[PDB]
Ligand binder design. Structure first.
Ligand code: HEM
Ligand SMILES: CSc1ccc(C(=O)O)cc1
Ligand SMILES: [Cl-]
Length: 393
């Protein structure tokens, strides 16, 4: 009853253009079996949403990559939040929710927005830029390590460690093995920065440690929780901002609408998260035999959720291949859904909003004027190079 497909969603050919294969995966059935890796897959919005919101059947504590922690050893100690189920997940989730809370956003908004305005004005002096290296990457690196409270020494390990984290969710292909091999220097840097003396008071990392006083986490738990904020948040946000810029260049009508009403900046970024879905795919592991979309899945089976395909399912979205900055985006699964739904979403939205606001107020045109290159990652979708010419307003 379940169709078997030979599509490899972790192949360079798939990364290069996944959308025709995503339709094949959606139209083959609500549940497919991927013979290449011996996993189940769901590519439609309805089943992806259902799996995310059924954590007792589709668990995370056996890993959210291909590897099953009950069968293989994790490449690093399991995350206390991402790779945990309720109730172990609850108190670490609560600490990060408070650390990255609405009230926290008030303390960082002025500095984050000033840095975005200054970056755009700097780039307009140059004219022709790489919107990845010089904008999508440069801006988060100028605000988030400071907000974390990291020291200056060693920040060159931050992007390599993030790329490693997301490649390691993948299958044991060249991308994953190349990343894990000789990764000890990146791991050693990150683990050291998670210790309380190395985090600036008032930063995100020091605030996590401050919660050990409360009984929500123990002091021996706090370093691993800090590690989550050195694992997630960087590459996805970079990829999201780069996709937004790409969309505003490829859809010039939408840049003109954003210029006319800069208060659309926050929804313009949300639509880019849907359109690009920086986190493309995530796994769950079944804890029991379960019926999903009329198909029966055994216990202990890996289930691949295609978040990017779910966000482009024409069963759920009108003109899903169109970038539309006034789209009602509520319900997209680019940040997940349910108990694990991105705890850092307010930080991500703040960075993207203030960058798109700066562009909206200062830029009249964005023209691609050089070869565009893709960045390849087992889990993340995003661009490597995006040469554009910025015309001032
Ligand atoms: C556009 C940017 C981002 C995207 C697309 C994204 C995507 C996601 C998704 C899909 C999940 C759900 C994982 C699951 O259900 O297994 C998640 C969770 C998470 N994200 Fe984000 N994220 C982004 C930004 C951030 C930022 C800025 C931070 C930190 C400041 C962050 C930290 C986390 C953490 C710690 C979790 C685990 C939450 C939990 O398990 O309860 N992410 N993210
Ligand atoms: C959903 S991407 C991601 C989220 C959390 C962590 C972590 O907790 O280290 C790593 C990756
Ligand atoms: Cl590590």
């Amino acid at each position: 009853t379940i169709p078997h497909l030979a599509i490899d969603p972790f192949s360079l050919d798939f990364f290069d253009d996944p959308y025709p294969d995503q339709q094949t995966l959606r139209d083959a059935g609500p549940v497919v079996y991927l013979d290449k890796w011996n996993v189940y897959g769901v590519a439609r919005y309805a089943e992806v949403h259902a799996v995310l919101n059924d954590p007792t059947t589709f668990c995370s504590s056996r890993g959210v990559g291909l590897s099953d922690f009950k069968k293989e050893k994790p490449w690093r100690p399991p995350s206390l939040i991402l790779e945990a189920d309720p109730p172990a997940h609850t108190r670490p989730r609560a600490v990060l929710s408070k650390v990255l809370s609405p009230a926290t956003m008030k303390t960082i908004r002025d500095g984050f927005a000033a840095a975005a305005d200054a970056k755009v004005d700097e780039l307009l002096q140059r004219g022709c830029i790489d919107a990845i290296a010089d904008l999508a990457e440069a801006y988060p690196l100028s605000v988030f390590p400071d907000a974390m409270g990291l020291k200056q020494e060693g920040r060159e390990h931050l992007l390599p460690y993030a790329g490693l984290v997301f490649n390691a969710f993948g299958p044991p292909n060249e991308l994953r093995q190349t990343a894990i091999e000789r990764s000890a220097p990146h791991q050693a840097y990150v683990n050291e920065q998670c210790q309380r003396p190395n985090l600036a008071p008032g930063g995100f990392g020091a605030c996590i440690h401050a919660f050990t006083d409360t009984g929500e986490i123990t002091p021996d738990e706090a370093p691993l929780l800090v590690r989550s904020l050195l694992s997630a948040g960087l590459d996805e946000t970079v990829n999201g901002i780069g996709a937004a810029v790409y969309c505003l260049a490829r859809f010039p009508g939408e840049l003109q609408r954003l210029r006319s009403d800069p208060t659309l900046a926050r929804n313009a970024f949300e639509e880019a998260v849907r359109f690009e879905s920086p986190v493309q795919t995530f796994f769950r592991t079944t804890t029991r035999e379960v019926e999903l979309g009329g198909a029966v899945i055994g216990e202990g089976e890996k289930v691949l959720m295609f978040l990017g395909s779910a966000n482009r399912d024409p069963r759920r979205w009108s003109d899903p291949d169109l970038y539309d900055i006034t789209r009602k985006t509520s319900g997209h699964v680019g940040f997940g859904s349910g108990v694990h739904m991105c705890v850092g979403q307010l930080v991500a939205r703040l960075e993207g909003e203030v960058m798109l606001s700066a562009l909206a107020r200062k830029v009249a045109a964005i023209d691609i004027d050089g070869p565009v290159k893709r960045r390849f990652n087992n889990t993340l979708r995003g661009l490597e190079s995006l040469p554009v010419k910025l015309t001032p307003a």
